[PDB]
Structure 1
Amino acid sequence: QIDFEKRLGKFKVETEPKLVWKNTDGQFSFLFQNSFNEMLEDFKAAGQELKIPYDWTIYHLRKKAISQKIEKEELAWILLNFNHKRGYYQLRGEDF
């Protein structure tokens, strides 16, 4: 869904793709069901009840990636998420 030949890296026109979402016959499905089930087991261990959103999986991946192995698409998701919220970079003349 992304151009790579003329408009490098830009989304194809009138396309709004989600990385963790796959469309089949207009039906949207999650893409990281294994990590999702891992999060469900973790939350069950924590005692929280059930039926958590699908897209919380990013934080389970981020915690997991510190010490374990994650899938390449999960790595791309984490990098594209880190691109969002770079953070504050203080300049000269302030202490805080």
Structure 2
Amino acid sequence: GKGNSVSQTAERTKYRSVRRLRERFLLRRERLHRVLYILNFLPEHYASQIDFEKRLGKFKVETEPKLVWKNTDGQFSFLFQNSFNEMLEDFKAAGQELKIPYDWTIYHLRKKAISQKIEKEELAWILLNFNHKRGYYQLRGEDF
């Protein structure tokens, strides 16, 4: 009587659009994986678990690799120690604390890359992080 998405077809289309966005994000990630592997940027432990022959760029079945966490004999260790130490130095200068999660180093590298050299694995981490968050954009544009 009033009308509120009262249609099975509309709901199906909504689900389909969600799935399509997800699939295209995955495709972008896989293409990044392939390009970086050819460029020889990915860390060896990370690259080892990604298929590059049949299921291109995809993770090998029953694996959840992390670019920065290396698993040696069941123990996970952070990959970028010196960058973490630099971030801790900056935090100490800011006078806050000296105990922070390792993964915060991504933002310190993002700041540092603007005017300093960073390791290639760090660049790959940064690029995938950018792929994760793309931002708002309108196709037409037409600056008002």
Give the structure-1-normalised TM-score.
Answer: 0.94
The CA deviation string for residues 60-86 of structure 1, in whole angstroms up to 9 with x for no partner, is: 000000000000000000000000110
Where structure 1 has 5 or more consecutive residues not aligned to the other structure, the ranges are none
Distance of aligned partners of 1:52 and 1:69 in 2 relative to their CA distance in 1, 3 Å threshold: same
Question: 2 CA distance for matches of 1:93 and 1:19?
Answer: 36
- The reply to whether residue 52 of structure 1 matches residue 95 of structure 2 is no
**Count of matched residue positions in the alignment of Structure 1 and Structure 2:** 96
Structure showing the higher helix proportion among its residues = 2
Pick one of 16, 39, 62 that aligns with 1:14.
62
Q: Which runs of 4+ in 1 moved over 3 A?
A: 91-96
Deviation, 1:90, is 2.4
* Paired residue secondary structure (1:83): helix
Tell me the distance in 2 between the aligned counterparts of 1:46 and 1:26: 35
Give 1:49 deviation, angstroms. Answer: 1.4
Q: What secondary structure does 2:76 align onto?
A: strand
Could you say what the CA RMSD is over the residues aligned between the two structures, in angstroms? Answer: 1.6
Percent identity, aligned pairs only, is 100
